[PDB]
Write a protein that binds this ligand. Structure first.
Ligand SMILES: O=C(O)[C@H](Cc1ccccc1)Oc1ccc(-c2ccccc2)cc1
Lengths: 270, 270
């Protein structure tokens, strides 16, 4: 019954909004979109970063570039802190999806563990455009040009995403679309370790139906959109694979240090 | 109109039969040991592989292996024969896809370059069951167990495809289904290098409509099969990749060998 799907879509959309601070609507208005009433603090150079990290609401480190920690490492470490926040926001949204909390606790952990990266890159695209990504609750903007002028290892760290984001955003999806999509991702069924796949695919199936209806009604002239969105899941997978790679590579730069114990402890890998 | 779509499905199914000698239909008939009009010779060890050259058209070596192109090599030399055989075939099927031959000559080469291996592992699935795969046009059956006990590297060339096959075959798709799915794979548009994307996406958007109707009609009691099928394309991409990196391994540990030109031309790391 379409009566239930429309209902399921509104529920999830509602949770998505109350779960994620920066929405794509809120992000798009700030971005390319005009809507100028509080412009962001651009970061196009080493000086932009420095001459700004001391005036931007950031809770980790301040501008100190001169034989005192490097810029390429400070930015990466910075994205890990934030991704720990996102993981928490995603976990909360996961518990709003009908059926998720009723699943075996182990599988819930497995679904989150293996779906968090795909969700993050999907939402990252809401903050990015061909020229950069919004930063800090949408208070800054780190240009795409800067990010590529980063150290030898971090130079390819964000370029692939930018390429994915541009294609993904061409779909012109809104938060009500992304909400259902993000749920489909969480409720996969192919994640390794699942103890009871039936309920998971049962829910994904119901989420997939909602998503389909949501796209037909919300984008009536955008043919086969549903199909395009699902085939984007192939792109995210590579994005996640390719990500664990550069990670292992980075895991061969900074390592043995006695001050990282309880700090590294908080930032395992995901 | 859903009538042109049905006509497209029929058209495609028709060219599919005309380009592929061993359909899933014939393959399943041979695999269901019940149908004994012509059963296969089961390869599951050296003696079997050895005797396999008597009841099959195995032009390879029957006697000693190691000091004369070991068993492993022999098996993959043939494998290589099949891919090129499949490429030429898939290449023939592609020309039947409406509009494909009208695309930019270069894009045609790109659609095939990235499409053909995803298609080969899709169709290869029709020849597998949890236990093994039919070889030499169904005349033979090589055990999954035997294939996995080969030399350190060659040993794990097929396992990831058997795992794909087991879950992909659970979808119970038939030749008329795969025909349209196989066409959706080629007419991607997200393939690297494509000079002209719009025209390509107009064809695929057409192929996806067809496939959607085909699945609803041919598998009415199968919810979200369409979606399930499209997500399977993510598995395909991954399989292609692990494969190439394996090929790169042999390329270094076997300098006396050779990866066929056509396959070499198609393959590019990264
Ligand atoms: O990569 C390819 O194009 C094919 C794809 C394929 C794999 C399994 C069944 C049918 C096709 O798989 C090959 C794997 C190994 C080899 C090979 C050839 C000579 C020596 C060592 C490996 C050739 C093809």
């Amino acid at each position: 019954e379409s009566a239930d799907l429309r209902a399921l879509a509104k529920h999830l959309y509602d949770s998505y909004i109350k779960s994620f601070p920066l929405t794509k609507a809120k992000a798009r208005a700030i971005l390319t979109g005009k809507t100028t009433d509080k412009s962001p603090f651009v970061i196009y150079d080493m000086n932009s970063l420095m001459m700004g990290e001391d005036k931007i609401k950031f809770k980790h480190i301040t501008p100190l570039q001169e034989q005192s920690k490097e810029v390429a490492i400070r930015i990466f470490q910075g994205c890990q802190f934030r991704s720990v926040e996102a993981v928490q926001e995603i976990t909360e949204y996961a518990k709003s999806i009908p059926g998720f909390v009723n699943l075996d606790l182990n599988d819930q952990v497995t679904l989150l563990k293996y779906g968090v990266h795909e969700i993050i890159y999907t939402m990252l695209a809401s903050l990015m455009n061909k020229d950069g990504v919004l930063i800090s609750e949408g208070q800054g903007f780190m240009t795409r040009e800067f990010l590529k002028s980063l150290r030898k290892p971090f130079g390819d760290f964000m370029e692939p995403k930018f390429e994915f984001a541009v294609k993904f955003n061409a779909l012109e999806l809104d938060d009500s679309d992304l909400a259902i999509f993000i749920a489909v991702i969480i409720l996969s069924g192919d994640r390794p370790g699942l103890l009871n796949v039936k309920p998971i695919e049962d829910i994904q199936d119901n989420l997939l139906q909602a998503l389909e209806l949501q796209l037909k009604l919300n984008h009536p002239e955008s043919s086969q959109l549903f199909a395009k969105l699902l085939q984007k899941m192939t792109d995210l997978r590579q994005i996640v694979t390719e990500h664990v790679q550069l990670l292992q590579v980075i895991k061969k730069t900074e390592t043995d240090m006695s001050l990282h114990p309880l700090l590294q402890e908080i930032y395992k890998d995901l």
